[PDB]
């Protein structure tokens, strides 16, 4: 009870510092302490009641700086603190948590299109390199299922990807899985009831409203109901058995639309609006 959807950073004309939290119970938005540095193309995650803001970029009017930063938010203190930075800057990053460890997956540093992956141990405040992905992936979506980390879609420096791969932390190795039916970079990727969902993204021509679900048993991707709005660089999370997608770019506009997926009825509904339209946010629930 009383867990909130947090949204951190994002982009509208420049990278933003906002940290806001939505309560799906009462439909209320909280305005919380700003990030110390503006960030878009970051990822959000929660470990032991703390929210982490990982990687991304400060896209200023001045210019662009890719971020290696890891910053920790305590909802009890409403304060951001720096943590150990990653080995490399990672903009358009994917993250997932396994057993209280943060995995920072691919992303970019200028022309560098990362295949590398690194793991954070909060108790030691250190990062270590682990096995690299079999593909370079920026704009990659990450999901954790059955204690395996999945990396889905992205861009390899030449090709936009429908490919996906699976990381085995005990073995420290990656394996290609069944590809998506759609090429998707900047997709929202999340886990709901033992399925991976990949919602929206960009196929190289258009922003997508399509949604595919991965079934681990049959190892296949199937389409479910599409979103009302085409969106890439969207935020995504799961709250009480439902998927929330936040913002993104629809090909013309930076969206403020929050849609909600009910797996029971296979329908999307608009549930609220962010206070302002933005893409490339980091989202998590605690």
Ligand X SMILES: COc1ccc(S(=O)(=O)N(CC(F)(F)F)c2cnc(N(CC(=O)O)S(=O)(=O)c3ccc(OC)cc3)c3ccccc23)cc1
Q: Is 230 in the site for ligand X (CB under 6 A)?
A: no
Cβ distance 197 to 216 under 8 Å? Answer: no
Q: Is 155 in the site for ligand X (CB under 6 A)?
A: yes
Name the β-bridge partners of 71: 53, 82
Residues 183-202 binding ligand X (CB under 6 A) are 185-186, 201-202
CB of residue 186 vs ligand X: minimum separation in angstroms?
2
Q: Is 55 in the site for ligand X (CB under 6 A)?
A: no
As a whole number of angstroms, the distance between CA 246 and CA 229 comes to: 11
Q: Name the residue nearer to Na ion (CB basis): 69 or 143.
A: 143
Q: Is 282 in the site for ligand X (CB under 6 A)?
A: no
Q: How crowded is residue 64: how many other Cβ atoms within 10 Å of its Cβ?
A: 13
Residue 91 is classified by DSSP as B
Among 38, 41, 55, 141, binds ligand X (CB under 6 A): 41
User: Could you say which of ligand X, Na ion, none residue 185 binds, taking C-beta under 5 to 8 angstroms by partner kind?
Assistant: ligand X
Q: Name the residue nearer to ligand X (CB basis): 82 or 157.
A: 157
Contact residues for 58 (Cβ-Cβ < 8 A; gap 6+):
15, 37, 38, 39, 40, 64, 65, 67
CB of residue 38 vs ligand X: minimum separation in angstroms?
11
User: Could you say which of ligand X, Na ion, none residue 189 binds, taking C-beta under 5 to 8 angstroms by partner kind?
Assistant: Na ion
Cβ distance 117 to 132 under 8 Å? Answer: yes
Distances 61 to 17, 91, 244 between C-alpha atoms, Å: 15, 17, 31
Cβ distance 37 to 69 under 8 Å? Answer: yes
Instruction: Report, in angstroms and rounded to the nearest whole number, the Rg of the chain calculated over CA atoms.
Output: 17
User: Could you say which of Na ion, ligand X, none residue 249 binds, taking C-beta under 5 to 8 angstroms by partner kind?
Assistant: ligand X
CB of residue 13 vs Na ion: minimum separation in angstroms?
26
Q: Which residues bind ligand X (CB under 6 A)?
A: 11, 40-41, 57, 91-92, 138-139, 154-155, 185-186, 201-202, 232-233, 249, 279-280
């Amino acid at each position: 009870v009383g867990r909130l959807i947090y949204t951190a950073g994002g982009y509208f004309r420049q990278s933003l510092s906002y940290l806001e939290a939505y309560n799906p119970s009462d439909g209320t938005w909280l305005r919380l302490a700003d990030l110390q540095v503006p960030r878009s193309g970051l990822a959000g995650c929660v470990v032991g009641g703390l929210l982490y803001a990982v990687g991304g970029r400060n896209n200023s009017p001045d210019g662009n700086t890719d971020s290696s930063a890891l910053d920790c938010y305590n909802p009890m203190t409403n304060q951001w603190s720096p943590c150990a930075p990653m080995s490399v800057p990672r903009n358009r990053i994917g993250v997932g948590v396994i057993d209280g460890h943060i995995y920072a997956v691919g992303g970019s540093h200028g022309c560098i299109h990362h295949n590398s992956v690194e793991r954070y141990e909060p108790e030691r405040d250190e990062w270590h390199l682990v096995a690299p992905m079999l593909t370079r992936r920026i704009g990659v979506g990450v999901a954790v299922l059955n204690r395996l980390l999945y990396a889905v879609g992205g861009f390899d420096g030449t090709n936009r990807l429908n490919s996906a791969e699976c990381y085995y932390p005990e073995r420290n190795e990656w394996r290609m899985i069944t590809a998506m039916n759609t090429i998707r970079s900047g997709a929202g990727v999340c886990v709901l009831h033992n399925c991976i969902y990949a919602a929206g993204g960009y196929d190289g021509q258009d922003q997508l409203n399509s949604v595919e679900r991965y079934d681990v048993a049959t190892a296949t991707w199937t389409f479910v109901a599409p979103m009302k709005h085409r969106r890439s660089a969207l935020g995504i999370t799961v709250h009480q058995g439902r998927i929330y997608v936040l913002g993104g770019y629809d090909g013309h506009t930076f969206l403020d639309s929050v849609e909600c997926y009910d797996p029971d009825t296979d329908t999307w509904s608009e549930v609220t609006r962010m206070t302002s339209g933005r893409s490339g946010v980091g989202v998590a629930v605690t």
